[PDB]
Design a protein around this ligand. Structure first.
Ligand SMILES: N[C@@H](CCC(=O)O)C(=O)O
Lengths: 206, 204, 203
C-alpha cells in the first residue's frame, strides 16, 4: 500500500520467484521474466527452470514421443495489460517492481508494456493471399536458441511470439515455444537467460 | 505534441519503404530507441514483390537469388542520404505510431560511434597495441523466414561499413542462405541488436 | 548518458589479459536501462596464444578456449585479479572516462537474488531449487565477422569467488573448428542482465 521504491518502468515475476508457472502441471516451474520499459521498446530477459514433472529431467531415450520434446508457455493480457487466468504464469508475483519484490497492490494498467497492436496485429485471413498489402506472420516472432544447463551442446529452439494468442479473449500475448531434435538423456529443462526486445504499445490518449 | 526524439523509426506498420531488388518492393520495419550510450534496435524485413517475394532456389539456382543487402547511409547530421535502400518519407522521429510533421534536422545521437566503428580499418605493419577491430563493426546472427526455425538466414549487421554518397555513418543488413528454399517469401523474424552511439555535437 | 554508462571506452588501448598482460582490447559498454543493464562486448587479441589461432600447429585444448573475468567488490569496483585492467574502466565522459576512479557502481552489478553467487541444491526440495543456467547467456560470436568462424560464447553472472568478489561478469570462449591463422577478433554481442538495486540511502 504505497512505497518510494516502486518502479513502474519494470514489470516482472520477481528475480528469484517461487514456482509460478505451468509447463505440464500447476507450479511445476519457475519463469523469471523481466520487462524493462526503454520508451518505444520493451527490453526483456527470460529464463525457465522446471522443478517437477515431464520436463524436470528430460529423457527422450525412455520417453521418445514428440510431446516429450516440446512445450509452450503463454502470457495472456486483457485491454489494460492485466494477466488473464488461462496464462501459464500465475499472477500472484507478476507485478511492477519494488526492490527485489512486487508493489503492495495488484497493478491496474500495464498497456505500455504490451506488444504494439500495429507492429504485431492479431490477423484476418480471407481470399487475397497477396494483394501486396499482405501483413507479416514472422515480424510477430523472434527465433533463437536457449541452452539447457548453460551448456552450448544442449540447444533448445526458442520462438518468442507477440499477440499470436486468442485464448480467454486476450487483446495482447507473449508466447514462448520451446522444442529440440536432440535426444537428451537426463537433462533438466533449465534454460540459459535470453535477452530480447519488442516494440511497445502506447498508453491510451485520455 | 506526442513527438518522441528518443525513438527514430520506419513506423511500426510501414507502407513499402525499401529497395531490395527494385523501388518499394519491401517493408523494412526498423526501430532505433536511444538508451544513452547505446541504441536498442529491432529490425524485420518483408519483401512484397520481385526476386525475393517468393524465394525458389530450385527454379532460380545460383547465388544472386540467395543473398542481398539493405543499406542506410547517413550524413554528418544523421540525415538519411538518397543512395539508401530505405526511402526517407516515413523515416523520422516517433509521434504516436506515426512520424513527426516535418523531416528531422539532426539524429547524430542515433548514429553508430565513429571511434568504436571507424569507417576504414587497415592495420598496417602497425604495432599490435595500435590494431583496430574489423569484427567489432559487425553483428553476425540468423533471422528465420516465416518465423520458422527450419528456415534460417545468415544476417550481418555492419556499422559505418559504407562509403557510398560520401556517407559519414551507415547501418548495413546483409542477408544470405545456403538452404535451397522452395516458395518461401522473404519475411524475416524480428532481430534485437544494440550498437554504441555517437555523442551529440558541442556541449554534450 | 554519463553516470548511466560504465565502460572500457569505445576505442580502448590494450586493457585485457587473455594469456599475458595487455595482450587484448576488450570493448565492454554497460548502459543502465533501470532494472536491466544493456551490454555490448567485443574482444580483439593483439598478441600471444590467441592473436593468430592455429589449431593445426597447436592442437591442444588450452589453444581452443579461454576465459575473461571481471571481479567486483561490494561497491562494484573492479578487483585486481580481473582480466580487465581498471585504468580505463570507469563512467563515461564523451568517448573517454571521468577524471577520477568511481567509488560505487553497485547499480551496474548483476542482481544477487537473480544470480546468486553460490547456489547448489544438495538436500533442496524442488520449490527451493536454484538455477545454474539462469546466471548464463549462451550464444556464438564470429571471428572477423565471418559467419563460417563461430565461437561458442557464454556470459556468466556472479559465477566467480576469486579475490573474495561479491559480483562477477565472465566471458568464456571456446571452438571445435580447427582454425588455421585466424586472429581472435569477435563480432559484437548484445546482451542484458537484471541489475542489483542501489542500497537504501537515508533508511
Ligand atoms: N549534455 C546536455 C544534457 C542536457 C540535459 O541533461 O538536460 C547539456 O547539458 O547541454
Amino acid at each position: 500500500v504505497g512505497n518510494k521504491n516502486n518502479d513502474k518502468l519494470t514489470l516482472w515475476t520477481t528475480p528469484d520467484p517461487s514456482p509460478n508457472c505451468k509447463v505440464s502441471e500447476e507450479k511445476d516451474s519457475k519463469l523469471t521474466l523481466v520487462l524493462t520499459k526503454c520508451g518505444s521498446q520493451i527490453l526483456a530477459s527470460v529464463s525457465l527452470l522446471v522443478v517437477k514433472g515431464k520436463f524436470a529431467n528430460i529423457n527422450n531415450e525412455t520417453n521418445p514421443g514428440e510431446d516429450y520434446k516440446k512445450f509452450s508457455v503463454k502470457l495472456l493480457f486483457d485491454a489494460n495489460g492485466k494477466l488473464l487466468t488461462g496464462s501459464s504464469l500465475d499472477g500472484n508475483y507478476w507485478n511492477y517492481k519494488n526492490k527485489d519484490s512486487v508493489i503492495g497492490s495488484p497493478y491496474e494498467n500495464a498497456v505500455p508494456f504490451m506488444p504494439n497492436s500495429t507492429a504485431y496485429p492479431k490477423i484476418i485471413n480471407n481470399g487475397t493471399a497477396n494483394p501486396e498489402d499482405k501483413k507479416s506472420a514472422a515480424k510477430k516472432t523472434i527465433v533463437t536458441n536457449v541452452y539447457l544447463g548453460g551448456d552450448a551442446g544442449q540447444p533448445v529452439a526458442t520462438t518468442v511470439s507477440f499477440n499470436k494468442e486468442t485464448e480467454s479473449n486476450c487483446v495482447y500475448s507473449i508466447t514462448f515455444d520451446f522444442a529440440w531434435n536432440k535426444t537428451y538423456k537426463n537433462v533438466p529443462f533449465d534454460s540459459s537467460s535470453l535477452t530480447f526486445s519488442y516494440i511497445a504499445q502506447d498508453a491510451e490518449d485520455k
